[PDB]
Design a protein around this ligand. Structure first.
Ligand code: UYQ
Ligand code: UYQ
Ligand code: UYQ
Ligand code: NAG
Ligand code: CA
Ligand code: CA
Ligand code: CA
Ligand code: CL
Ligand code: NA
Ligand code: NA
Ligand code: NA
Length: 472
């Protein structure tokens, strides 16, 4: 193997670097993994399928136009170039290599398609038809849309889209499950808290945040416990950005935001699936947890969980490491079937007032087929009223002592509508034993005399009862 000769490959610092500030993709390419045989689709504003750096890898079977209801996802050209974003993301995954044009994709021999679905009214049905496109042909989906990143919205998939996620992970990809890679949001300037976005907060999406070139949390990032890992993206004007294919058969050096991080993750996942095509949607999340790297990502909330892994709400388990992903994938043993242990916590409603703590010792379905000794995702499904939602901060502590922030204060969230069975999700207790005392903390972070009631707290544990590693 020889490294790519493309003219902008040297500018793709997050791949081509030799300073240890990269995604370690060359190490995967040198193991022989470039994405051959894998199919990725960008769910966004279309794909310029005739782009000189995409045409060679373009896959009509990975593509559709849901906005206009036809097979051709070609973007709508406008003076502002509004519909350029899906083309930028497609090239991050699978721009052609060694062809004298722009740079390369992470998985530069993968097949790449796009769904034109953001350029029109985006209904639940539009979302569902995109998520459910050709699920026995497309392996990996990449998306960065969801509720407005204004820091005051709480919303997620409606019924058709939620059904598309469950059909994808259950029957997609021959029963191994569609891999939905998702960006955690761009609401950092609005102090948004991304578990309020039900798309990234889902267990069925493999959620990704961003780091700047110098290893910092970018201005646009949202922190939340549902995030799994990180890839590089843009930062300040002294830091480089993402280099990729652009609309009108051009090359950009200024692709930005968390929406540029999810496609890079999708490309790394494509390399990993080439290394072991039998990996399930859950296997893939395990690989990410085990291989991602905190090193040189700066945050003030790095904490060690109960199995010795460092986790952050900005970064999840850290920067994706492509070489480590493909290495660990090769001999990976498929995880056991997913168990689900439902624990209804409250015996009566609880006044919140200034601060509420709910403590409960659980057996995690001891003696039952859904007994869980090895956690994957955990959810605190909460139903509560409160007079100003954004003054609330919510934490969940596992028996092993891992404090997950379920909700941070959102100063713009003035809503009086509370949370209606909202399934706040944390990845930070992955591989812990969930037996023992869990603690839920709800606090009013303002000096205001706020008021409300918690009426339901369901602790939902997912996981297995076998296969643990020694703690890190
Ligand atoms: N939770 C969230 N992820 N929210 N995302 C919000 C949002 C808002 C606008 C656009 C426009 N895209 N326009 C294009 N792609 N041409 C995309 C996403
Ligand atoms: N359940 C939900 N809240 N789904 N939200 C989906 C969603 C939200 C905003 C946009 C904006 N697009 N803006 C543009 N294309 N200029 C697209 C999709
Ligand atoms: N903004 C929103 N409207 N969000 N709504 C979300 C949401 C999600 C799933 C379902 C499933 N319903 N399944 C049934 N009724 N059998 C219903 C609503
Ligand atoms: C895929 O994994 C399943 C579950 O472990 C196993 O039964 C099957 O033989 C595997 N298939 C291949 C081709 O490795
Ligand atoms: Ca079309
Ligand atoms: Ca190229
Ligand atoms: Ca958000
Ligand atoms: Cl479920
Ligand atoms: Na997710
Ligand atoms: Na700890
Ligand atoms: Na315990």
């Amino acid at each position: 193997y020889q490294e790519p000769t493309d003219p902008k490959f040297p500018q793709q610092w997050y791949l081509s670097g030799v300073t240890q500030r990269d995604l370690n993709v060359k190490a995967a390419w040198a193991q022989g993994y470039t994405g051959h045989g894998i199919v990725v689709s960008i769910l966004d504003d279309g794909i310029e399928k005739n782009h000189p750096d995409l045409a060679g890898n373009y896959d009509p079977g990975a593509s559709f136009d849901v906005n206009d209801q036809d097979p051709d996802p070609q973007p709508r050209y406008t003076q502002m170039n509004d519909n350029r974003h899906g083309t930028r993301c497609a090239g991050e995954v699978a721009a052609v290599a060694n062809n004298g044009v722009c740079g390369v994709g992470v998985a530069y021999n993968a097949r790449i398609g796009g769904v034109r679905m953001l350029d029109g009214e985006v209904t639940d049905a539009v979302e569902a038809r995109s998520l459910g496109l050709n699920p026995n042909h497309i392996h990996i989906y990449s998306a960065s849309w969801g509720p407005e990143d204004d820091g005051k919205t709480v919303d997620g998939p409606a019924r058709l889209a939620e059904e598309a996620f469950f059909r994808g992970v259950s029957q997609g990809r021959g029963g191994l499950g569609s891999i939905f890679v998702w960006a955690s949001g761009n609401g950092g300037r609005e102090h948004d808290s991304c578990n309020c976005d039900g798309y990234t907060n889902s267990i069925y999406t493999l959620s990704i945040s961003s780091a700047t070139q110098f290893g910092n949390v970018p201005w646009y990032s949202e922190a939340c416990s549902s995030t799994l890992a990180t890839t590089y993206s843009s930062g300040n004007q002294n830091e480089k950005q993402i280099v990729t294919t652009d609309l009108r058969q051009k090359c950009t050096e200024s692709h930005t935001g968390t929406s540029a991080s999810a496609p890079l993750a999708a490309g790394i996942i494509a390399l990993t699936l080439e290394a072991n095509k039998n990996l399930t949607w859950r296997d893939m999340q395990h690989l990410v947890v085990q291989t991602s790297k905190p090193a040189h990502l700066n945050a003030n909330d790095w904490a060690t969980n109960g199995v010795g892994r460092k986790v952050s709400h900005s970064y999840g388990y850290g920067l994706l490491d492509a070489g480590a992903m493909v290495a660990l994938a090769q001999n990976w043993t498929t995880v056991a079937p997913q168990r689900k242990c439902i624990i209804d916590i409250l015996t009566e409603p609880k006044d919140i007032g200034k601060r509420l703590e709910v403590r409960k010792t659980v057996t995690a379905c001891l003696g039952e087929p859904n007994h869980i000794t090895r956690l994957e995702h955990a959810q605190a499904r909460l139903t509560l009223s409160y007079n100003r939602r954004g003054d609330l901060a919510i934490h969940l502590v596992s028996p092993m002592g891992t404090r997950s922030t379920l909700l941070a204060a959102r100063p713009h969230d003035y809503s009086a509508d509370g949370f209606n069975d909202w399934a706040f999700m944390t990845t930070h207790s992955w591989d812990e034993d969930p037996s023992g005392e869990w603690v839920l903390e709800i606090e009013n972070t303002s000096e205001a005399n706020n008021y409300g009631t918690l009426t339901k707290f369901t602790l939902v544990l997912y996981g297995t009862a076998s296969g643990s590693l020694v703690p890190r």
